[PDB]
Amino acid sequence: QKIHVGPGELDDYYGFWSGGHQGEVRVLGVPSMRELMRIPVFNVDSATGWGLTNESRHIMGDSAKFLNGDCHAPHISMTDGKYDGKYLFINDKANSRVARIRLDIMKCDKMITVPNVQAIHGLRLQKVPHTKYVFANAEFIIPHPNDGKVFDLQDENSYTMYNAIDAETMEMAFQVIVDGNLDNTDADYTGRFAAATCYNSEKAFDLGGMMRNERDWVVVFDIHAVEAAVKAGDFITLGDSKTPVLDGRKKDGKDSKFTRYVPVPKNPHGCNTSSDGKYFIAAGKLSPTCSMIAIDKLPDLFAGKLADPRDVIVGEPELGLGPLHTTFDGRGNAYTTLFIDSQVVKWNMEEAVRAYKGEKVNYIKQKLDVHYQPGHLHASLCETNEADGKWLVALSKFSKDRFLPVGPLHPENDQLIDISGDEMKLVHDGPTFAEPHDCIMARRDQIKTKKIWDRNDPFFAPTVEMAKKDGINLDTDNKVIRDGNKVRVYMTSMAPAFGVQEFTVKQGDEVTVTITNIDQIEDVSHGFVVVNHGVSMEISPQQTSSITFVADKPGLHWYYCSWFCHALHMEMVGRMMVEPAWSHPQFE
Amino acid sequence: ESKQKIHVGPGELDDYYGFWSGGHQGEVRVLGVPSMRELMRIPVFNVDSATGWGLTNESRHIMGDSAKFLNGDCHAPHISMTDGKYDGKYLFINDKANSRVARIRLDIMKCDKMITVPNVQAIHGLRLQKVPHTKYVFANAEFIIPHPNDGKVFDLQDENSYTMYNAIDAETMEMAFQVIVDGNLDNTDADYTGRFAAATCYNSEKAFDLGGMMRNERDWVVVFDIHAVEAAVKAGDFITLGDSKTPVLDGRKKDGKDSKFTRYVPVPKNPHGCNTSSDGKYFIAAGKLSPTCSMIAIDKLPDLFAGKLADPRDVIVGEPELGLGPLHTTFDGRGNAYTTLFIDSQVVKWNMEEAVRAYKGEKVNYIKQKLDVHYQPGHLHASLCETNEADGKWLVALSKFSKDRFLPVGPLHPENDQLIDISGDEMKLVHDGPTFAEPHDCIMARRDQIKTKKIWDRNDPFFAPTVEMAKKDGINLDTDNKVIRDGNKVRVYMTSMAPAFGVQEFTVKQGDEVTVTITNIDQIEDVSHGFVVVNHGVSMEISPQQTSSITFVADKPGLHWYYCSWFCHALHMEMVGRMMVEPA
Ligand code: CUA
Ligand code: CUA
Ligand SMILES: [Ca+2]
Ligand SMILES: [Ca+2]
Ligand SMILES: [Cl-]
Ligand SMILES: [Cl-]
Ligand code: NA
Ligand code: NA
């Protein structure tokens, strides 16, 4: 299997890395593991102006005031159990958000703050018949309402919720109150069932309390029952949110119609659907096991045909110390990270099932040492029925001496492994920044991108509407619109020249600069920086971008194109003239 | 023969550090060479969610008032030198967008000082004094502005409209002096004695439009007599501008008479790169609109400033014709120069002494090879090229239009930073490295030239101001877990030790201004902790033996979780605490 990509050769797969604590999404080529692009999401990006421009701040909404995010889990939208290449979704644990990235323009186009919860951690997409819903876990138990009258996690109104977001509209679809808490989650291959692990069935806040119970559980959701209750109006709402809320808790030992609790040891973490649709596999973390939940026994479970929720467990292989995450090669093998043993263990799911029934069989096929302390891992196409068993990435937290020292902070070691054969083969150590934690791979032919924007693209439609109110045709006009203490500069740009090369304002004016890049050739990006005003953005071909700032400094202030666009780029500049406040009417 | 190994396999280590400019994204990046893998990101002018640079009190203190900016625009990373060799102490880099120079300490790989250059706009080129050591950082301000810039005068042709050459004291990171020049400044370099520096000018016309800037057949390389400048400062013969105490010297021509501080050497045309050869013989200016480089003999500059030469052009000793669009030059230490040809889209290898002899009229071919690169190269960098130890092993050419060299990724494209083996007679392209936001230029150092710390010193100046605040509250940071109440201000101090915060709950009043100071008292390498307050925009990292702090207001009543962001321990997921906010 081709391991190295030489000059002029192209990678075979796209890789989509979580930006971890840094808050972006990163696009890699696989197997070279080179970073092809960064997609700003929850971070503020100086280069493209994401978080500064009006288009990006509009998408982020009120949360545009936050400069941070914390990502764990990127996933790609699916139709009939295969990637369709339309959207990537990712979480923000720091400020409780879900973001959607449009894979044709490789930009975040929608973002939502999940109401009435704290810390969006695990995130996973419905597989069948398509990604109708984004499932997202809120990790932490909070009071409802959280008005500062009650702080007790044990109070009857303290809880966290499982969240369903409508993938196309990016509005809340529903929420399900659960017992315990939520960690990771996955979905079946029918659309009926989803499942999530829980490490805090104790509803404790201290380390000892969260580890008391021998077993926590994975909670299973009957999505069809949830929908039928919504359509029937059998739900409540919390605070000012209109989101339908359904109660998935047990009440005095009696289950709700929406959930079932399958006991699993112990503080389990990963929750992974095998690519043949057979199992929800939970990683036991503090228990040296995984637990295999038979998805085809779920209907019986929810219909009372089983006495014990443990009856849906058909395997619980002992694997090693600190199992965290599981992936699949599509050949009947699972691969599980062992955080303490610092290994990836390859095991056969059907053989593990037969061992659970008493049959003495050795389901463990190989243990590969990794470097060191692996968290999550990802096999190519593992989340689809097309899992091709070619590549595996294990994302290890302590890289130690695997890379040159770079001071007190260390990179994550994202290790590429060849699994095309019977023997796992470590081939590349990929160091990464701010603990990406997890990633997703897609074949080259599963991703179709645009090189030139469409002029009607929703990403900047609000700006077109604004321009229209000013009587502006963005494809041609170079005009300075004045409106009291607001100035709205509209210009085209075509390398190497800004369409407006100087304009004059009063000190204190609120200036919006809107630039439409009318170059028609691929890869002619322009930039726009106002010196010493903290203003910076990128404009790609046929895109419109805008940014607003206050001209609070009298005098002449240069602006320049930051992105090399032409042999005469260094000369693509302009001048803002700011008339001193003492030469104009003075206010207080 | 050029035949170095390019593969760094699992378990093997890179041979060089590479320090990449973060370009328009504003950070510094540390790569391993020859793998070309990014080992670390060092936040500088960007706001970093992961470590809290731009949010923490220690980082905002370093940034000063400019902490209000969330952007930077970087081009020119350079490493401090002693006796013309890298000494591993500091990395310096420019911010063109908000007119700054930042210093990075290479032992901790963090920005530790930052300065806004007074009375200028757009710090672009930057370069370090080489000998006897990096006393000064030299920084170009690119754009001509009025003085004062108070909005009475906007005419760039006015007698008080000009830009300035900036010298920053490298060790104190305070301004040392500024030199007013004619025209504008592009790139700059320094000699191997400490007496001379030089910079290219493209806007000798002092025009604001594209046509007017390309008006003159020749611009120039302005040469600076730094000894003369220092002598005038020492004698008090200078002025100051506005509210800056920086000594300002007038380096402009006056009615055709030269300053004592400058000489203007005519060079074609809108020249860009300005590169000192590793043998110390030449300032080499890249011709850009002229298909040439011009070679200024550093040995002739003393006679030039002494008035012993009949024409400023006499210090020009070579002007090789190389190709279309020469922008930048580097050196292998074997006598060759390597120059980017933006238009021809090549790296041309040429022999400097043979060019000098050609300029005198000898029939000799100084061009050795042209290597196609992909595509439109800007700057280039050979290993140790800025030192008298230039080792002629690796060359990076940083090309702007990657076209079809990588998988498509939407309307934006990566820069193509191509690794080239120059160890033998023939340049060999060996690796295409895609990079984000046009790093533009980079600098390499041998592994043994960089020595980093794995554990912070408790006395480190980086968080000394926080140690001081802690003193005023009576806090021993190594041990204490205490909540100090002071009006509507709450100062939480805690140790942390994987997997537990030293303070796991505290209660405040809605509207309080909360400062959380965390001291990581783990003593094992690479056990970093994080601290994130959910839904409050608060995030930071704390490495072993570091103290880090962050301030935010508790504007939301109720229970609000905080958690450790960096995987520190098998029980990392359970390392959490609770902030309880009592309603007003
Ligand atoms: Cu337009 Cu550079
Ligand atoms: Cu401490 Cu994660
Ligand atoms: Ca538990
Ligand atoms: Ca010129
Ligand atoms: Cl998972
Ligand atoms: Cl240069
Ligand atoms: Na939204
Ligand atoms: Na400073």
UniProtKB/Swiss-Prot annotation, chain A:
Q: Which GO terms describe its molecular function?
A: calcium ion binding; copper ion binding; cytochrome-c oxidase activity; nitrous-oxide reductase activity
Pathway given in the UniProt record: Nitrogen metabolism; nitrate reduction (denitrification); dinitrogen from nitrate: step 4/4
Residues holding Cu cation A2: C561, W563, C565, H569
Q: Which Gene3D superfamilies match?
A: Cupredoxins - blue copper proteins, YVTN repeat-like/Quinoprotein amine dehydrogenase
Task: Cite the EC number.
Answer: 1.7.2.4
* CDD domains, sorted: N2OR_C
- Recorded protein name is Nitrous-oxide reductase
Species of the source: Stutzerimonas stutzeri
What's the encoding gene here?
nosZ
